[PDB]
């Protein structure tokens, strides 16, 4: 059965079904609560190259959605738009009532292509995609989400500015996926798994101030050197 | 009790919720937009509540996933009602001895 957390004397315990605990008291349904917690609070990798490898594609399982009433402020959120090589769409459209996560600090908008096996994108570890008060088990197209888990509790008897970072992915869903951080419609930077979002913003600002933007009709891809870490090469 | 087996723990829970509790703000026509109905809070102090609560969240996910698989609901909204009904049934669900250890009635 679903475990239920009881808060007593500022301590958390698991309710015991067989043993009837008399001191536990429930006066009204207001005390019952469900709260969603992000996975980043457990100290897990949050960069796109490491984040996108926890999701897989499958077919033959219908998606399910369950609500939650409270959440935690999220520093990293993701927004996916993936196309098949012929041009079709992989991720299903967002059903009515589903909206993006309300409180995000950085939103990693990733758009790219991939083989797109299966029909739906599930979480390989069994977690949920939180969305807005509606945690689902699949990813919807163009909707901000954040990986998290839902817990149930009996409560004791008693600015916001976002930032969007734009990526481009080739071979999404496979073990050989290539990511590029987009600074302009023509200029890109090769992406590693060690760059914090603030470092990416600083790279953007440095590239613009240094006049490193592409001036031709072709594409320009920079590559930051590993040692100096401030001299972008090519 | 619950012991946190996660690699690391964030002890502060900076949370947002929807419940509030003026003038004409309750009317939907004059009410806030869909993005301004939330509040904020920060439970900086805890006696290990946050670190055990995260482990409880991790623990409950297997049962939650199995329950979601079993049901045919497109969207489930009634788990808390079932929990409350189960609580009431366990407390009082039949013949109840006054002095029995399975009853919450006490004499005085």
């Amino acid at each position, epitope marked *: 059965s679903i475990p239920l957390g009881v808060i007593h004397n500022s301590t958390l315990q698991v309710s015991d079904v067989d043993k009837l605990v008399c001191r536990d008291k429930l006066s009204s349904t207001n005390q019952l609560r469900s709260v969603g917690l992000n996975l980043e609070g457990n100290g*897990v990798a949050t960069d796109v190259p490491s984040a996108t490898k926890r999701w897989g594609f499958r077919s033959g399982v219908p998606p399910k959605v369950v609500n939650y009433e409270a959440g935690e402020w999220a520093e990293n959120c993701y927004n996916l738009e993936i196309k098949k090589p012929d041009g079709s769409e992989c991720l299903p459209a967002a059903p009515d009532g589903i909206r993006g996560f309300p409180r995000c600090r950085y939103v990693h908008k990733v758009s790219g292509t991939g083989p797109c096996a299966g029909d739906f994108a599930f979480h390989k570890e069994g977690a949920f995609f939180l969305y807005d008060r509606l945690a689902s088990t699949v990813i919807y197209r163009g909707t901000t989400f954040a990986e998290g888990v839902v817990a149930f509790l009996i409560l004791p008897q008693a600015g916001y500015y976002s930032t969007t970072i734009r990526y481009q992915a080739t071979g999404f869903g496979t073990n050989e996926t290539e990511y590029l951080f987009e600074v302009d419609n023509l200029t890109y930077v090769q992406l590693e798994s060690r760059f914090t979002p603030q470092f990416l913003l*600083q790279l953007n600002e440095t590239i613009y101030t240094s006049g490193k933007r592409s001036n031709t009709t072709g594409k320009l891809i920079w590559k930051v050197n590993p040692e100096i870490d401030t001299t972008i090469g090519e | 009790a619950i012991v946190n087996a996660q690699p*690391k723990c964030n002890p502060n829970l900076h949370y947002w919720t929807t419940q509030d509790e003026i003038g004409l703000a309750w009317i939907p026509y004059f009410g806030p937009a869909a993005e301004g109905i939330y509040t904020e809070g920060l439970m900086h102090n805890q006696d290990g509540l946050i670190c055990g609560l995260r482990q409880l969240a991790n623990e409950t996910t297997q049962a939650l996933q199995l329950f979601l698989r079993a049901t045919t609901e497109l969207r489930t909204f009634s788990i808390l009602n079932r929990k409350a009904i189960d609580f009431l049934l366990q407390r009082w669900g039949g013949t109840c001895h006054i002095l029995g250890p399975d009853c919450c009635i006490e004499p005085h």
Partner: antibody
Amino acid sequence: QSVEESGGRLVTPGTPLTLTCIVSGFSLSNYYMSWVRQVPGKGLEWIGVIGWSGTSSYASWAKGRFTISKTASTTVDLKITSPTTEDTATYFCARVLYIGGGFNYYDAFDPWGPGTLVTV
Amino acid sequence: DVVMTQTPASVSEPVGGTVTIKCQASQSIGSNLAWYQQKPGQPPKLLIYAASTLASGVPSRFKGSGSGTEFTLTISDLECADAATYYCQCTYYDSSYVYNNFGGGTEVV
């Protein structure tokens, strides 16, 4: 990956003071930076930290006595406001280290600086 | 707030033995621990992180183990160059939660 500190000098109580820590081999935008002091012949004391997001966090016992800020692009400063005779110590400066996993978390304070000396 | 206690205040041993230092944690912190050695007049130097992983360049003689609430650090084949104070630090919380996470200090002779 090396840092160093400067600014230690003798001042009377109440005289504001500022120290400076500079780095080499890494970027301030990829790591936090912590200040740890040590009274002579005593144990280490964590003072505060400055993050790569720009915000800073202070210890409870040093909530308002110290400030930590980022000047220029590769320097940080610890400003002591109204020092007393109890703040004579060897101040240090370290970078938090994470090997894999997500950011905002650390595993050790690897590159300790030589440490400056402050006398009151 | 996890409180760390270093049990042996001071240890003395003839050259070539094995010195054991115990570091105890109030709560359960898994394997999040670090060890430092501080020579006089020098900043602390990292020896072990994650309570079992050797640092880069430190000799293999220093070896740490333990988990949960109890951790131990063993220095095998003591040399005259290993005389310093040793500290154990907890790395269980995030980098913004600042507190007194260090230890007392064990003087090895």
